[PDB]
């Protein structure tokens with residue numbers, strides 16, 4: 166028992182991290198089969214970062230201007246293209262540590278692991294959620310661009326995130342691995358703000374199930390509610406509306422604990438309206454929304470990869 | 471910027487995890503050079519777990535009763551010994567993925583990464599602290615025994631923890647890698663309780679420095695205090711006493727932020743005496759004590775391994 170913010174084992178990804186240098190810029194890259202993926206702003210200087218013409222910038226570059234290093238192995242670049250906001254460098258050697266993998270675009274509210282890297286060197290691993298507003302609340306310093314997020318299912322790594330920038334508010338924005346930004350952001354230094362965020366209701370409920378499974382049960386009450394009534398409360402407190410699809414996804418946890426989803430919604434309504442009273446749930450003084458229902462069952466079952 | 475509960479990249483350790491089977495028991499093992507390390511209760515049955523005679527139990531076993539599997543590679547066991555509460559199995563093949571490593575016993579209040587494993591398969595990675603009472607608040611299910619904690623410095627893995635058991639209170643106990651338990655625990659199913667725990671004051675202060683570095687600064691006040699005065703407050707609220715050695719360790723963070731340690735102690739005293747008022751610090755509604763000063767500087771500097 167116990168409940169932690171747990172990340173996937175990062176080994177399969179550590180072996181894909183390389184250092185990509187173009188001119189003065191060095192940042193991180195992802196080496197899979199014979200292709201290296203990195204943020205296309207690798208080709209930018211300080212100026213022209215306020216309205217970079219990436220086509221015109223990429224045209225001044227040749228295969229030999231892109232230095233790719235994996236450890237001290239120097240890769241030979243034989244092609245280069247740009248796809249959306251990602252640069253794709255074709256190299257003459259297939260990465261011998263390429264795991265089984267696919268590229269996936271994740272939905273808001275889903276979670277993934279981040280392997281923060283600097284100069285192509287892995288530094289730390291942590292878990293986090295795509296916010297409803299398509300930001301992530303990361304921990305990233307200058308030089309972390311090209312770090313990636315991922316999920317792992319048995320032996321298959323699903324890459325879903327590559328890190329591109331930090332907004333003036335300290336939150337983070339990036340692309341899927343086809344280079345398409347999550348949310349409204351562009352890779353220019355212009356004034357761009359994230360939309361209104363919200364709390365991930367279905368994740369908050371999965372976490373209350375996780376709390377009951379571990380014995381943190383003081384918040385259960387003898388009330389119940391309706392989807393409609395609960396969604397009234399969710400809107401007052403800036404919670405995502407709860408749908409029938411969310412209820413269904415909570416079905417397994419409902420069956421394991423014997424607590425109906427609408428009953429757990431009545432617990433959550435009581436907590437939103439009255440706060441926690443200085444008590445704690447699974448070691449937290451606030452409602453956590455960065456565990457999906459899948460995360461709760463994985464960690465309350467003992468699943469391996 | 472941003473601040474996360476970050477674990478070390480677990481790749482160097484994933485390659486050392488094996489599955490050890492003795493009779494009906496399968497659990498996790500650590501393969502380094504030509505030696506596999508695992509909890510010695512691998513040789514126990516359900517009964518005789520209430521007062522196992524490990525010497526007499528180990529005497530009924532031969533090299534060939536210990537099945538070590540790494541993936542589907544079957545290792546050939548050529549020797550076996552017991553050291554404290556750890557079994558050491560000599561195998562005829564050196565692990566080709568053995569990282570640079572050492573065995574270290576860590577001090578209470580220090581942090582480390584845990585690679586939870588089941589049937590020799592890595593499942594998740596998370597960070598946590600050796601509590602002052604020599605427990606860890608983990609996330610572990612049945613089958614996780616033999617999972618290890620570790621820190622990494624450049625290329626050297628320092629193994630400090632191997633997981634042995636969960637206490638009736640849901641907290642976790644284990645050994646260093648020479649098999650010596652942390653704290654008062656024994657590997658028998660008898661009634662044993664952890665001592666009174668406390669909060670890790672120097673870690674709480676390092677985290678308040680981390681909060682100021684990231685812009686969470688509402689808790690700063692214009693008061694100061696003395697070590698002696700602050701330690702009066704620490705004792706009332708069950709905080710570890712603060713020593714001159716703790717102040718010195720906070721020296722770097724003091725110099726970077728320009729906030730004297732005794733000034734930050736006056737902030738902490740205000741928070742202990744008045745609570746947080748429903749506000750948050752680095753996304754938390756309570757005082758976090760599982761980041762050491764080293765952890766804060768690593769994550770607020772961009773250090774790689």
Ligand SMILES: Cn1cc(-c2cc(-c3cc(Cl)c(F)c(OCc4ccccc4Cl)c3)c(=O)n(-c3cccnc3)c2)c(=O)[nH]c1=O
Nearest residue numbers: 190191206305306307308309310330331352353354355357
């Ligand atoms: C050359 N170079 C550059 C970077 C690098 C670039 C960026 C970065 C990239 C682009 Cl396209 C930007 F439009 C940008 O504008 C910030 C901004 C965005 C939106 C509205 C207003 C503003 Cl002001 C910033 C970055 O945000 N970070 C970073 C820093 C801290 C944490 N996370 C990410 C790092 C790097 O890491 N290595 C390296 O060699």
Ligand SMILES: Cn1cc(-c2cc(-c3cc(Cl)c(F)c(OCc4ccccc4Cl)c3)c(=O)n(-c3cccnc3)c2)c(=O)[nH]c1=O
Nearest residue numbers: 495496511610611612613614615635636657658659660662
């Ligand atoms: C055969 N076998 C056994 C285990 C296994 C053994 C144990 C375990 C090992 C020993 Cl020596 C015990 F004295 C023990 O008594 C619990 C206890 C301790 C102190 C006071 C009172 C009591 Cl009642 C328990 C365990 O605690 N866990 C576990 C479970 C959940 C989370 N973390 C750890 C697992 C395993 O994983 N695989 C496998 O094959």
